[PDB]
Design a protein around this ligand. Sequence first.
Ligand SMILES: O=P(O)(O)OCCNS(=O)(=O)c1ccc(OC(F)(F)F)cc1
Ligand SMILES: *Cc1c(COP(=O)(O)O)cnc(C)c1O
Ligand SMILES: N[C@@H](Cc1c[nH]c[nH+]1)C(=O)O
Ligand SMILES: [Cl-]
Ligand SMILES: [Cs+]
Ligand SMILES: [Cs+]
Ligand SMILES: [Cs+]
Ligand SMILES: [Cs+]
Lengths: 268, 393
Amino acid sequence: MERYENLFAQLNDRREGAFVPFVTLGDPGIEQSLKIIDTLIDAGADALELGVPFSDPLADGPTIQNANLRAFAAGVTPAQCFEMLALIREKHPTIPIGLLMYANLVFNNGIDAFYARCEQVGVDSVLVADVPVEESAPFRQAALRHNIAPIFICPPNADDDLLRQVASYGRGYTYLLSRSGVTGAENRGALPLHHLIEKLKEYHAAPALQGFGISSPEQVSAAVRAGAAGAISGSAIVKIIEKNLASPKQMLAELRSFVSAMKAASRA
Amino acid sequence: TTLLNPYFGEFGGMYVPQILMPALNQLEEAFVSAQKDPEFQAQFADLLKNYAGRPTALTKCQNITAGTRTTLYLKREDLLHGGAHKTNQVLGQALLAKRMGKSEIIAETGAGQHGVASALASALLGLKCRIYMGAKDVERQSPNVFRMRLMGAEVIPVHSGSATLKDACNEALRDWSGSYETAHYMLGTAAGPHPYPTIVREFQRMIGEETKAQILDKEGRLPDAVIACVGGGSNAIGMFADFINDTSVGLIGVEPGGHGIETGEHGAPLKHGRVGIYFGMKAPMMQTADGQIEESYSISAGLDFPSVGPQHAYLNSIGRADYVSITDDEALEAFKTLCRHEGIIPALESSHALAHALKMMREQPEKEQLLVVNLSGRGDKDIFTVHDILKAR
Ligand SMILES: O=P(O)(O)OCCNS(=O)(=O)c1ccc(OC(F)(F)F)cc1
Ligand SMILES: *Cc1c(COP(=O)(O)O)cnc(C)c1O
Ligand SMILES: N[C@@H](Cc1c[nH]c[nH+]1)C(=O)O
Ligand SMILES: [Cl-]
Ligand SMILES: [Cs+]
Ligand SMILES: [Cs+]
Ligand SMILES: [Cs+]
Ligand SMILES: [Cs+]
């Protein structure tokens, strides 16, 4: 399919950036996670980044470490996540859906089979957090054989060779890291660089989404003004889940208010 | 792009977030440079000799083998400063950190021995050391935690995941992903992403080099086999490395069998796990059917790394090394036997290697065989564990 291409084309037509929340699938349970995700969409999410619970999320700070732990407390498995994904797609035909994976869950019972399952449930992209471009070949090849975009990461100090590789190998969107370190709203990254955003454009890369530390409307607006196609926010969204575990209705209300505010910041 | 091969056959690699690739490339470059630098080599040799106490003895154990055709030597890493082989490679990594201009060290530890080794090297060489340790390990390793603190290291409990070694490994990498510009990650075994399996081997290879010289001196020929326990694989690859090209020398690695392979409660991923990708490497590991990482179990807390170094997986695949397992009860019997018959208290880790050697002798007592067991550490730390079990008997 061409869900990211279609989205960016539509957003470009409206001089608009993308706002893309991250949540952990099945945090804090399957039924509530499905409701959370429907709320994110109704409040204006342009695409989703969805984490499959993993025992050792080594690119994630405490907020998302805790989301994984909550999903495991609810007994959430990758199989259940694929069930959730199929239902999400059945409800929402056009929204781009990206997975945040760790390598072992992809490689576990066969790389090709993993990407085939993604295609079957209607996933659009897969970002494997612990696979650098240098190790990416079997993952990106399998992705493309199954019409899945492999997402690659552009660190803020990326050199020319790396920019060229990320531009060539990735599809769907280019992940623009705001800073070194791990996920977390407590650590704000940078306005990227004209250089990076411009070089990616020069090399015809997939449109950039800035992520890590994005927790406020002002940062979304800033990312888009800098030339990114949009922004990803995870910890700030997950914190609302964490804060409101005992209050599921209030959780959804606060998620709605926050996502609405973040999305508004992306509009021209 | 790298200067050295990051793989051993299919095993190994550099499976880290993109943000950490420059750190690994920097470390590899510094290592390759150091390896060609006679001054670096002389500084390392000086610390090993005058601070750590190398060369370590090679002890012929005559009482243990009486009445058989086995001749058994123990390579005495138990006599190295700190009481285990880990001291060798921490000194080399500390000097690499200095070479690169870094003033801070990060380390992970499970049972605490690597933490103590990292702390002592950092104290000596003027580095600020912070050590990640799963909260459950902190609770159960108060002696080692106190040693680390006395040596001026910061110990940081890790409460995430299972609150054990794998979780400390993650936290170390999370820290490094933000701090690499000023801090070096002093990884504690011959595993993780390239270049660590290579560096740790090269900074442990004096074990086998000395063993070869010592056995030639005493016996006039190479060993029939060298035998070492395998946690993550550092002491074993250190013993094996100099003998890899001596095709007649058997290389035997011993994984912990815990309560028995058939119980599932073991730490033997090389022979009984499944290949996965974790901790920066493709290697056999302890994992669930779905691919979640699991703990290793052994009576010896030092053998609880839930995977194995990729060079071991490779040496196994080509048949250059054989890997076996030894249960808790077998290790305990070897521990008792060495104490009573040789007056040496071995680490319970090392007791796994000794137990396999004792089996080689006992199963075939008229087989002529010259064996060397790597005695990776001393067992003072284990006396209560052994006491408590033997009391409940
Ligand atoms: O808003 P924050 O700071 O919590 O960041 C949320 C990011 N969530 S995500 O799925 O895009 C994401 C993207 C990349 C990650 O690691 C990698 F760069 F190494 F690949 C981890 C998570
Ligand atoms: C840590 C330890 C081991 C196991 O680690 P390796 O990296 O496999 O050597 C073995 N023996 C002793 C004494 C240890 O402290
Ligand atoms: N758990 C052991 C060995 C180890 C494995 N990885 C790092 N260290 C120790 O910390 O001493
Ligand atoms: Cl390869
Ligand atoms: Cs705006
Ligand atoms: Cs000595
Ligand atoms: Cs003998
Ligand atoms: Cs092992």
